[PDB]
Design a protein around this nucleic acid. Sequence first.
RNA 1: CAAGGCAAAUAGGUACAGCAGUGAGGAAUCUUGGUCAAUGGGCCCACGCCUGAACUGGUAACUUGGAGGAAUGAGACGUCGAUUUAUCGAGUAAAAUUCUGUAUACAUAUUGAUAAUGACAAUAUGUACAUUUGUCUUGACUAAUUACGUGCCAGCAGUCGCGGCAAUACGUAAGAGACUAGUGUUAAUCAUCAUAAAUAGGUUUAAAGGGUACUCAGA
RNA 2: AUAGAUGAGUUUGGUGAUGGCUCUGAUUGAACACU
Lengths: 60, 95, 128, 290, 283, 98
Amino acid sequence: DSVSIPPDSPNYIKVPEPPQSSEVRHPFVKGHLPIPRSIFPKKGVPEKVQSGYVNRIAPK
Amino acid sequence: TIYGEVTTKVSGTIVRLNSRPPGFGLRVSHRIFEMCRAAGIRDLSAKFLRSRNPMNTVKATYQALLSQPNPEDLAIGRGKKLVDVRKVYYGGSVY
Amino acid sequence: ATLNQVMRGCRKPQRARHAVSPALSSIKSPALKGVCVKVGITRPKKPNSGERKTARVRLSTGKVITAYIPGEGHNISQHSVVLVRGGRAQDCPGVRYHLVRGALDLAGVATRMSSRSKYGTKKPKKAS
Amino acid sequence: MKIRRLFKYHSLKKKPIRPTWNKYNLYNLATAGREPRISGKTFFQQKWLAKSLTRAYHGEHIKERKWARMFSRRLPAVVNMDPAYMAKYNGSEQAAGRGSGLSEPPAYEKTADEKPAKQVIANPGRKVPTPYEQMTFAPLERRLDIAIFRALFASSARQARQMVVHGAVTVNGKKMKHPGYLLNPGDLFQVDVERVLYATGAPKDKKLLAAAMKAEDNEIDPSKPYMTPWRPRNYMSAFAFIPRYLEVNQNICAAVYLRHPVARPGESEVPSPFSPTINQLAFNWYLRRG
Amino acid sequence: VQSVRRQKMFSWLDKKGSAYKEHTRQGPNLLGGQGKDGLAVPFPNNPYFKSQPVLSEGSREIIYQDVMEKGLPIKAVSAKYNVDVRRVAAVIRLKEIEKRWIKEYKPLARPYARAVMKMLPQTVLGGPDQKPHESINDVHVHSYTTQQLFVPVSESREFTREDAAKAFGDHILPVDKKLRVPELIEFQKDLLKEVPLQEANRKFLNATAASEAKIAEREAKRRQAVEDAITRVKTDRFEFRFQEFNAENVGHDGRDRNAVGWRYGVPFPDRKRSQIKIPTKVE
Amino acid sequence: VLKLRLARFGRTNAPFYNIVVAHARTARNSKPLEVIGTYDPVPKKDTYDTTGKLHKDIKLDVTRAKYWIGVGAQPTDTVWRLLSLVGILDPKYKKPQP
RNA sequence: CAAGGCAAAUAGGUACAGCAGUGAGGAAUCUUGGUCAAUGGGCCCACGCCUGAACUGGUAACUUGGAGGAAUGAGACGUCGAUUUAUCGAGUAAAAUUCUGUAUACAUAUUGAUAAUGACAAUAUGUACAUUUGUCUUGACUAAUUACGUGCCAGCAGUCGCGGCAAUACGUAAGAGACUAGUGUUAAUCAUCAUAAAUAGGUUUAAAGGGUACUCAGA
RNA sequence: AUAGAUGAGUUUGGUGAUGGCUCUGAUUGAACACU
Ligand SMILES: [K+]
Ligand SMILES: [K+]
Ligand SMILES: [K+]
Ligand SMILES: [K+]
Ligand SMILES: [Mg+2]
Ligand SMILES: [Mg+2]
Ligand SMILES: [Mg+2]
Ligand SMILES: [Mg+2]
Ligand SMILES: [Mg+2]
Ligand SMILES: [Mg+2]
Ligand SMILES: [Mg+2]
Ligand SMILES: [Mg+2]
Ligand SMILES: [Mg+2]
Ligand SMILES: [Mg+2]
Ligand SMILES: [Mg+2]
Ligand SMILES: [Mg+2]
Ligand SMILES: [Mg+2]
Ligand SMILES: [Mg+2]
Ligand SMILES: [Mg+2]
Ligand SMILES: [Mg+2]
């Protein structure tokens, strides 16, 4: 925050709304994104997160 | 609005009236809009199921408004309160 | 029907209804070009009476149909290229099409003032 | 290009109520019929009559297709909760009897007894209807050009639309040139002071000014578009009102869009010159546009 | 010659419509006249729309001093003058803009202000407490709370607002928690316990003053996390802002509303009706 | 060959990019393995800042990008310049001082 | 490798379902542009080269979004059409007056891009400009009227219908009701249609109970 | 996602049913006519 919030911005005074006071219906977004692959197994601690793993598979 | 749902049959003309929340409006056909707008109803949903005979649609609709489930009688019959949830929530009847 | 009868395929598509203009509905086309094989007159059925100006057109698809000529007076004749659209003459049997007035050879009603877009009539431009 | 729909904008024969401060409009509003004739009309003839009357005022400058989808079946409302009631009662008494509370004797017995029964416990201000039907055209109250006209910064909804299109309005300190911008709760729109004084000021008359050449307070300045000293437009008081979803500040010609218009029990916040009977038919028309 | 319809107009416009040509009184002068509740009706055919009063110029200043000089919490100034917190926050923003103009020597529209304020009804916050400006306890009618439910329960159950909230839904709250100044309930409960008014007011200020501390603390930590995620690299021309995010939060099927990136497998909606192509948020 | 590159999206005269992990020999805008972030080339300006300074908004999952650079991903020249500013790689080009 | 088409004959190429473009077919769908500046890709130690991928200019109301002007306007004691020739309308409409400077034009700056490279354009600011109406309907469904002409003729028609000499339904005139840079029509799809009913139908007399019930599979 | 469920014309001397047809709503990578 380099420039102070002027009195024109709606964020000049923060007055949070009470819960369940709005029912805005967001529109369904079309399209999808590629699901990033998993790098570790879902059970157990893999050898990839050990102490000397990088120094073993990428020596100097 | 009316109490709950009602379905009346008059000689192959079935009418189904449903109670709707406030602000729903009279989303009903033309002849039911007149009867509701005259009796003081403002939120209702109707549906003809079998026949749309002009005469029997008015007789079945009028008979349905006179055969609504009375919560005061349903409670004494079963021996249990039928609490008006919307009345307890706002502390009184919000017309 | 029972759940077993439905599982075996009792529900089938309802029998198709014939279209008003089959030559156009069959191929999803809004209009078709054709040559006039004959230009004559058709007689309405029982209730109505008069002479309906019709034309036997050979569509570009090969079908020969009978089209109604809307308006008062026409310009087409034998061996005349005209555009055909849907819609039928209700009192004429077999006349299941109309001819477009602003078509290739068929001209629009010249002395037309109301509903000119229906008869392919340019504006008189008398004001300009 | 003047379209055919704007020819008789203030017809004294048709008497359409328009969103402006014109003197011909004031006469049509004052002499409007107490109730349109819907005695023997069919359901369609009633919905079309109500749609024509209301659309002559609400969103007059918006196409029928754009408003057909801008129309929303969601009529917001609020209820007033008295802290004094919620602090003394937990709502159980409202479920006494058989679920709907105790029964009170009929009206033809109360007055018969000289002693009036004790006041029934309930939240104050209940059993009063809410005018939901009057909120049919609430979505229009969110457009920027309309909010400017409701803040009394313009003499008409069309004049306010020109202030926006001509870069004279500033929302949240940023220039806004889209009259269709839908204000959000908390937005602060500001109009140029010069355009407000001309829009709401009196016309610049040369004949009267010609006599005032030489013959807190203000002075004369013929180098301005409005007549000096600035005085309010004629008949402006008949249209002077600010709804409660706006917080206007005339010193700087700025206003804040506090919230969206809502319906309260016994009150509506949508300025509409038509009765619930007409707003109920207009609402029923736009359910299926037929 | 003028048509008879114009002749009737100017006749009415000079005899009965002359009272509106110029505003000489102090207050609203509308066609509908004073209503049954003391408020002016602008349109006679719509009795429900009324000309609600406005905060007078003096009242706006009083609100500015209590929130800026005296440092009282907004919830306290709201409950004190019966002004909604959303309006109190607006009166301050608008007043701050005046101080800018007065400081920058900009001329205020004083002629327009005075002439218009006379046309509108006004409330004077201070000595004369005639009526509250507005209801500060209006709760929003939630869709779930609008349904007609008649729940069967035992003949002698104590069905409270907590039980009613659950009858509408599992996630619904009672109106006791949907207030903008919920401290008023705890304040009213003190009076029931025969607590002196002077002490009840003390607990109310400390309650509101303490609630705003948490709100101001949440916002501070929030904005901090928004900055800790941004890496600002200054180049010779611009300042590159690298915002960090978790690229794995795309949902179980890749269709997540809050996912970051131009989604694949979707054409342009630029040919669809009711397509919004103007800014929807001027932040 | 895995590459950290940009997928040009947006409209005419309104460029918008996706930072993606895709095989080199594939279509530019084909569905990649992952979307690491976005990149907007047109510099923006703070709303209430009258100083005239501009900036560029770039969303990047640095943790996910470091893993791919570690296993042998080859970022393009544009993505290389971005990754060098955040402080992951060394610049490939520099302004000659002489 | 074979075959037919085009080219080729002592040859052995070609197939535009790569971009632009032509002919044909069709109711019907566009430029034989610029640049590798941006993004991507091939080759290269490097520099660099190539890219009808791509980015950009062009054509079409095909669609969507936006603009396409606001305020004042009372006796020009003028005009026009009906008609209870003095009533009802055109009509605040016009003229005129006071303002704005929207699309757009021009100019400056910034930006798309940086190690360097800008084909083309966006955004911002300043100055300047007030520019079209079109189309359908008008018996009922379905919002909206008369007069004349025509006389089961000419024609209208989505459904029911209209027209046979005093037609609100045809044609013309005026008015009125609507949408509007679009408006109608044709074609198609969903919904209407519990009108193939899983959710959720029905079969005495209206479409629909098998001539019969012992029985394998199946429920 | 808790507001979302609607009809109209037309068979009969007449009435109530059965059952199609058409209109009312939304739309198109549309075409045509008048613009
Ligand atoms: K039926
Ligand atoms: K080609
Ligand atoms: K390149
Ligand atoms: K009939
Ligand atoms: Mg027939
Ligand atoms: Mg006409
Ligand atoms: Mg080929
Ligand atoms: Mg051809
Ligand atoms: Mg490259
Ligand atoms: Mg190299
Ligand atoms: Mg401009
Ligand atoms: Mg290069
Ligand atoms: Mg009618
Ligand atoms: Mg016609
Ligand atoms: Mg006619
Ligand atoms: Mg358009
Ligand atoms: Mg049998
Ligand atoms: Mg047999
Ligand atoms: Mg048999
Ligand atoms: Mg019989």
